[PDB]
Design a binder for this molecule. Structure first.
Ligand SMILES: Cc1onc(NC(=O)CSCC(=O)O)c1Br
Ligand SMILES: O=C(O)c1ccccc1-n1cccc1
Lengths: 134, 140
């Protein structure tokens, strides 16, 4: 009944179908992920809903906001708590190999869409000691 | 320093405790590249204890950048909800710290672990792990 989220799910599934790497481990620990950001709040939200449908094996944070980076010039840097309008969400995964596959699928999916969707960025991330999701 | 009535806010005391621990480690906090390639992922405790830790971390460390507080999903066997399992939100909170160096992320992870162990529950239940971002995060 949510055609927008289902159409994103189908786009992701079509891309993820090219790979057969393991998505879970016997340990079940959350040791990798994909960090997804930019675009717009709504385009990220839509991508998050489609990711949830396409990947039952992942876990997702809500959207939240990124802080600023470095400011050019000699003027003051932003304080560490200052929030931008750029949003992000995190995908938690049990294998790094599937994180890499998902990162590539998200990149390939969003580049076929108009702005602001094509401005979504993604990087793999790893958690040294894992994240003990509750 | 001592505030009115012989008390400081918890976040100020966190900042001072972190400053003391971090002074033990003379490691690089920035790079010429300036890229945000490392982090610490801080979670658990309670919303109030994380609130104080986040505010104290900011005060102690100008070289870092912090997300707001937010919520974690469940791991195995999520709780109920009308939406898919991967989206269901627990009551456990988290924040992230972005950093320019891997070594300082390690030092900060150790400092937070050491500091929260000296506090009463629920602060001592806060968890932390280093993280790394393969391609960096292009903070705005
Ligand atoms: C910021 C922001 O932008 N969209 C969001 N929603 C979710 O991530 C899932 S629904 C909960 C809600 O929206 O309050 C949030 Br939080
Ligand atoms: O809704 C979005 O912005 C979106 C997000 C991620 C991937 C595809 C999307 N899309 C865009 C048009 C049709 C699908």
């Amino acid at each position: 009944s949510n055609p927008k989220f289902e159409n994103i799910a189908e786009g992701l599934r079509a891309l993820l179908a090219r790979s057969h790497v393991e998505r879970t481990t016997d340990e079940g620990t959350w040791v990798a992920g994909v960090f997804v950001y930019g675009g717009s709040k709504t385009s990220l939200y839509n991508l998050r809903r489609g990711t949830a449908l396409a990947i039952p094996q992942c876990r997702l944070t809500p959207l939240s906001r990124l802080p600023f980076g470095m400011a050019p010039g000699p003027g003051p840097q932003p304080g560490p708590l200052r929030e931008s309008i750029v949003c992000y969400f995190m995908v938690f995964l049990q294998t790094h190999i599937f994180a890499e596959v998902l990162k590539d699928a998200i990149k390939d999916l969003v580049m076929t869409k108009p702005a602001p969707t094509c401005n979504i960025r993604v990087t793999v991330c790893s958690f040294d000691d894992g994240v003990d999701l509750p």
